Amino acid sequence: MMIVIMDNGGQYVHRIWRTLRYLGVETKIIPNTTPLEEIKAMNPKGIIFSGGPSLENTGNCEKVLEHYDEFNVPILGICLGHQLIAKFFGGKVGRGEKAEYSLVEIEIIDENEIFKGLPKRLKVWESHMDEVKELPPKFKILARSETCPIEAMKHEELPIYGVQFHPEVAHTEKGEEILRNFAKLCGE
Ligand SMILES: [Cl-]
Incomplete structure (x- = not known):
């Protein structure tokens, strides 16, 4: 399917695209500020809200959520994308303890899906x-991880997913497979 990646300016955005391309998925990166009508014209079968440095630069990602019925496809938010989904839907986002990147062990308490078969x-x-x-x-x-309770989440009714970590970075164990599982929800 056509999976649209809304670019919130993050350093790893191109890795999302390259991973999907390796998996044989049709995908395009677009600016987060792309007008909604232009997004709709791409006929998205899924949308990814990419990482980025700031919640002050999320463009039309919240607008897509506001207009979710016009899209009605699976959505995955990565890092910033996970956070902006949480804020939109009524959760709380705040500064965490460790800002530096590292490899962190998580436990999947609900396989669901994005973690299916992993x-x-x-x-x-x-x-x-x-x-x-x-x-x-x-x-x-x-x-969840040792100190972070919400490393990944999903809406209980809609196919809207968030991950705090970067499955598109190869250091992430089974990151490609997480993205493949998401792509499979979208079709093919
Ligand atoms: Cl990123």
Whole structure:
């Protein structure tokens, strides 16, 4: 399917695209400020809200959520994208303890999907410069780490997913497979 990646300015955005391309998925990176009508014309079968340095630069990602019925496809937020989803849906985001990137062990408490067929525990590449501190209503925790309770989440009714870490970075164990599982929700 056509998976649209909304670029929030993050350093790893091109790795999202290259991973999907390796998997044979049709995908395009677009500016986060792309007008909604132009996004709709791309006929997205899925949308990814990429990482980026700041919640002050999320463009039309919240607008897509506001207009979710016009898209009605799976959405994955990565880091900033996970955080902006959490804020939109009524959770809380705040500064975390460790801003520097590192490999962190997570436990998947609900395989669901993005973690389908994968080990229960994974080492993932991530920062906690910011973090989802309080789960939005109508969401479920999918994964946690020793000190971060909400490493991944999903809406309980809609196919809207968030991960704090970067599956597009190869240091992340099974990162490619997480993105493949998401792509499979979108079709093919
Ligand atoms: Cl990024």
